[PDB]
């Protein structure tokens, strides 16, 4: 029932997921013309949100910024984030030690090995996870992926972005306590936003489903490869349900 | 979590009373926890439609908060409320008091707010009532003028604007004369009543001088029956995209501003009975 | 003014039971169970009521 | 398996356009209403393009109040549409010139004539012209460059906004391009909407910017455009894909809402 | 001012409807089945083309 999918990642791009499965992996279609259309981790996505302290940054970085530093963060930190050109589709199956990486991401449901024996896990990074939780949770604890920027000076400044895990399902509720621990985005992008008299910035910040998981076997964790260690969190039996970008500011 | 509810009434049903669930059995209830056992104290948002402060902000924050289910099969004192799997078509009868408009999103109404019925029936001082399924237009005009009439308290005086929900707090529309519940002046509505007023602020410049004069040098041009309203209620750039981030912008707050007012969609549907009592719906 | 001061206080108990000789007829039923179906597995709820 | 809905042709068929439906099997079709009757008046986007007056704001309104369809086949002049339904693996077609990568979100628009016409099987005033399928946020900045277009189409009568126009007029995303139309009554009232907010987005708030029947009037005809304007921004994408067939004639997707 | 006012009346009509011996001959298929997964109220799609 689950629907699954065979994409081209480059085998410069199918670590850390090859080592241990489960990531988000986004697409996009960026700036130069000879490799335009990406396929990417939330690891590799970890290296352009702020969030990701320097020093954890740059150690996934040192993993695979490699190729991140080639062409793709001067796509990504270099020329500047928008919640357009990443798009969240699921969590990797198919490992795939072949000649070309060919990883089969799920669309919907719980991201398994086949013949039903292993369940992927979602590995969210630590930074990028943890602080905009809600309450203490029992069982259907819903993942929103939120990109929240701050105005400093480029018209955007620093791109940043969140994984939410949260209980509350609705929209206008969410982005309200959202709203509650952003007043310090909402006050500089408020600056900037009446900064700009022609020129533009573009809005705060962006919401949407990813899923739900176990949620009471949630723990974090850490996972560990060539460039040293990386603290994470695991989440068991991750559904997948990519939903709708809902902007928010 | 789960899919098909089993519920219980420890209360007491009578011949009339079986009778009575087969129309609700229809109809539509949020569950508080999403187990396949609950108990009926809990099943629906009854428990508190007897908030005794009763504000249609907490009503409707808590329906957000809700998830709804599809109530089955009247055998013994048993409810299949079966928790709709997305995208999929149920029939559902109607208690909200309108045809539905056929072809439109229909949408959850929390507490009615025109007098306090009780929607199955009265046993052991419980009632089932029911969110109310009324169109997405309707639930936002709803929302609308919520958030309008205590607009009004905040640079106006209280006795004109008691005057003015007095006008605009029953609200026209074909079989939906609905009277607001005596608009609450409250912290819920406050604070997004001040993200009202910063979204505002920010199209204050966002707001291309274009974009001012667009309305005000039409009229200029020529006429439209918006644009006479409209004029009551070298110079220019070149910088299309910039314009264009300006443009993406305004859309976020526009949108935003309005899912201020407007609350969240629900069954789209597929075939309403001739009767227009029954809707084949999908997506909750 | 003077004060009154009230408090419950909570007391773990084991509470005895003594009935008579089939005080009270239970009538129960066959069970039925229902199929919830998950992608990662299938939970059963048996209902007997 | 699923819903299926029929189509009756009132034409005597013509054996090319049997031949051209037989390769448009994997098509996917606009439809007012799932009623189990279908006339050819009713089916196609020939029901949005008929008034010459309207535009692209109720040609996207009405491609979202109306049905979308997958075409599955043809039964002398009868015609098989099976609804689809939110979850299920459907085999749909690019009738669009925007090519599709896979994983891609996908999305309705109604087709536009501006410069990339591409008719159909049309007899008797009638086309069966379908909606381009074309990504979700290139669908958005479609509808970004149309109602920009109807902003600045006003300052047409000096040369730095016309330039602004004639340098706005294009989109272009991967590997497919294409122009789009000059609005110089619904995006002329959408604008009106726009310019409501904007005028008086420094006019109705400045008294509650201190503190945090006249206002009433100003913010209904405020959030009644708002409203208006934001109706038609949520682009409701219909497929999300698994894989595309290479050629880019076909893809097997999943269906959204 | 002369005018004439125009009055939209809607009729329930009822039609006679007449055919010769064999005008339309139909084929009936056989009335197959359609089950679905079991779900409490077990519904079958009984239909025929």
């Known amino acids: 029932q689950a629907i699954t999918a065979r994409f081209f990642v480059r085998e410069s791009l199918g670590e850390v997921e090859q080592k ?10 960026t700036g130069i013309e000879m490799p ?17 302290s320097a020093a954890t940054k740059n150690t996934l970085a040192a993993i695979y ?21 990443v798009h969240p589709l699921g969590c990797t199956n198919s490992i795939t030690p072949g000649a070309t990486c060919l990883i089969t991401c799920s669309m919907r449901g719980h991201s398994y090995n086949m013949l039903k024996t292993e369940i992927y896990p979602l590995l969210v990074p630590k930074e990028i996870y943890l ?4 309450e203490s949770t029992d069982e259907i604890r819903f993942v ?3 990109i929240t920027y701050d105005y400093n000076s480029d018209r955007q400044g620093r791109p940043s972005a969140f994984v939410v895990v949260s209980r509350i399902t609705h929209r206008h509720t969410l982005i309200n306590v959202l709203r509650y621990r952003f007043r310090v985005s909402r006050f500089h992008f408020l600056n900037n936003s009446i900064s700009g008299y022609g020129p533009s910035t573009g809005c705060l910040g962006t919401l949407q489903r990813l899923g739900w998981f176990c949620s009471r076997d949630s723990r974090s964790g850490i996972v560990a490869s060539r460039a040293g260690q990386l603290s994470v969190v695991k989440l068991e039996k991750f559904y997948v349900d990519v939903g709708p970008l809902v902007e928010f500011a | 979590m789960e899919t098909t509810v089993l519920v219980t009434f420890e209360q007491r049903l009578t011949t009339g009373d079986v009778g009575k669930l087969s129309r609700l059995i229809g109809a539509v209830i949020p569950i508080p926890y999403r187990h396949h056992l609950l108990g009926s104290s809990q099943v629906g948002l009854d428990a508190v ?3 005794k402060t009763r504000d249609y902000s907490r009503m409707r924050a808590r329906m957000r908060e ?7 099969r009247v055998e013994g004192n048993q409810m299949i409320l079966g928790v709709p799997t997305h995208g999929q078509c149920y029939t559902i009868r109607n208690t909200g008091p309108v045809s539905w408009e056929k072809g439109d999103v229909l949408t959850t109404l929390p507490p009615v707010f025109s007098g306090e019925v009780t929607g199955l029936v009265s046993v052991s001082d419980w009632d089932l009532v029911l969110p109310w399924i009324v169109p997405m237009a309707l639930a936002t005009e709803i929302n609308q003028r919520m958030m309008m009439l205590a607009l009004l308290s905040l640079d106006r005086s209280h006795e004109e604007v008691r005057a003015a929900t007095a006008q605009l707090r029953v609200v026209r529309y074909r079989d939906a004369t609905l009277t607001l519940p005596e608009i609450t002046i409250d912290d819920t509505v406050l604070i997004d009543m001040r993200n009202v007023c910063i979204s505002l602020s920010m199209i204050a410049n966002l707001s291309s001088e274009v974009t001012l004069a667009y309305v005000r040098k039409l009229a200029l041009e020529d006429s439209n029956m918006l644009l006479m309203k409209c004029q009551e209620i070298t110079n220019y750039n070149i910088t299309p995209t910039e314009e264009l981030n300006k443009l993406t912008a305004l859309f976020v707050m526009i949108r935003q501003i309005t899912d201020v007012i407007s609350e969240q969609p629900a069954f789209l ?3 309403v009975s001739p009767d227009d009592k029954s809707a084949l719906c999908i997506y909750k | 003014f003077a004060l009154t001061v009230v408090r419950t206080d909570t007391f773990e108990t084991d509470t005895l039971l003594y009935s008579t000789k089939a005080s009270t007829a239970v009538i129960i039923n066959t069970p039925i169970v229902t199929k919830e179906d998950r992608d990662i597995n299938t939970v059963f709820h048996v209902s007997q009521n």
């Open chain 1, 36 to 52: 335009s259309t990406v396929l990417v981790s939330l690891f590799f996505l970890s290296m352009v949100a702020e969030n990701v």
């Open chain 2, 49 to 51: 439609v007897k908030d």
């Open chain 1, 131 to 134: 602080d905009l939780d809600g």
């Open chain 2, 66 to 72: 809700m998830t709804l289910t599809i109530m089955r």
């Open chain 1, 144 to 146: 929103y992926f939120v």
């Open chain 1, 65 to 85: 910024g490699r190729e991140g530093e080639a062409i793709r963060t001067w796509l990504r930190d270099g020329a500047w984030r928008l919640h357009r050109v």
């Open chain 1, 20 to 29: 241990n499965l489960g990531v988000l992996m986004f697409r996009l279609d």
């Open chain 2, 269 to 271: 549907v597929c075939d």
